């Protein structure tokens, strides 16, 4: 379930397992030195049969690895206080105001902050000035009869902005 391709692969699947087991081993293991010991031990256990030219025995060892992992996880895996699941999970979302607002203000406060609204207005003219031709031509131009991907090409043509960028650029600053 991922934007790039239809699956992870074998490689990244093993990799995510290694990240999870190392993270759980943090969450199991305090004092950081025995942590470092057991981390090198775990790396050696993956080093034992890294170089199988076989594939089916490798993926079977992957499944038996997942069994001994899920038997040995932690009750509180150590989630960082910025991640979803974690302590924050858009903690300061109280002030994550989208910027389609701030133009519906009374012109007294548009007189209170003048230069900002002048440059914001030329931003919106930058948006609309290159909205129709380049962006919609680049979208209906390149792909197959079905799109069949979730990436999108840049604006390498000559000049102006890559397509469909407004709600990517204009976001909250994640600590206001």
């Amino acid at each position: 379930f991922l934007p790039s391709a239809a699956y992870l692969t074998h490689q990244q699947k093993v990799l995510q397992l290694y990240k999870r087991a190392l993270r759980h081993l943090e969450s199991r293991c305090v004092h950081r030195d025995k942590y470092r010991y057991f981390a090198c031990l775990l790396r050696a256990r993956f080093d034992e049969h890294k170089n199988e030219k076989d594939m089916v025995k490798a993926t079977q060892l992957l499944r038996e690895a997942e069994k001994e992992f899920w038997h040995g996880q932690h009750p509180q895996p150590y989630i960082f206080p910025e991640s979803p699941g974690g302590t924050s999970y858009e903690r300061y979302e109280c002030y994550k105001v989208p910027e389609w607002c701030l133009d519906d203000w009374h012109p007294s406060e548009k007189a209170m902050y003048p230069d900002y609204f002048a440059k914001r207005e030329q931003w919106k003219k930058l948006r609309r000035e290159s909205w129709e031709r380049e962006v919609k031509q680049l979208q209906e131009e390149t792909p197959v009869g079905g799109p069949r991907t979730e990436a999108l090409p840049p604006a390498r043509k000559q000049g102006d902005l890559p397509p469909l960028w407004w709600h990517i650029v204009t976001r909250p600053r994640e600590r206001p």
Binding site: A6, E66, W70, R127
Partner: protein
């Protein structure tokens, strides 16, 4: 080393120990390709009708509309009175009602007969 994680209606089966994810036939590759294609086209339509600088109103999803019209107005059509429908209807609609009815008859006949004897604690029971 582990009793292989019996599932439930509550405990979700996680991503790892499926074990159907490791029997990748070509049909699962075909299905994942087409499913990514469907998600690609829907995000394309949505993003183009999401980033229009002239678009004042809301994007007006037919998915939410279709779910709501299925949920409320498309119940009564369609229907047929089956044995399962009629059985569960008269069970979960009439059962608790008639049960609570008999137990309030029983409590009320107790209290009426008991204060008809006069030996109740209504020595001062004014706030009736």
């Amino acid at each position: 080393s582990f009793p292989k994680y019996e599932p439930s209606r509550l405990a979700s089966l996680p991503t790892t120990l499926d074990p159907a994810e490791y029997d990748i036939s070509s049909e699962t590759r075909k299905a994942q390709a087409e499913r990514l294609a469907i998600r690609s086209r829907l995000k394309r339509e949505y993003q183009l009708q999401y980033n229009d600088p002239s678009r004042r109103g809301v994007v007006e999803d037919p998915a939410l509309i279709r779910w709501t019209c299925a949920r409320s107005a498309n119940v009564y059509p369609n229907f047929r009175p089956n044995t399962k429908t009629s059985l569960l209807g008269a069970l979960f609609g009439i059962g608790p009602l008639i049960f609570w009815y008999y137990v309030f008859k029983t409590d009320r006949d107790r209290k009426e007969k008991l204060i008809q004897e006069g030996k109740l604690d209504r020595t001062f029971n004014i706030s009736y």
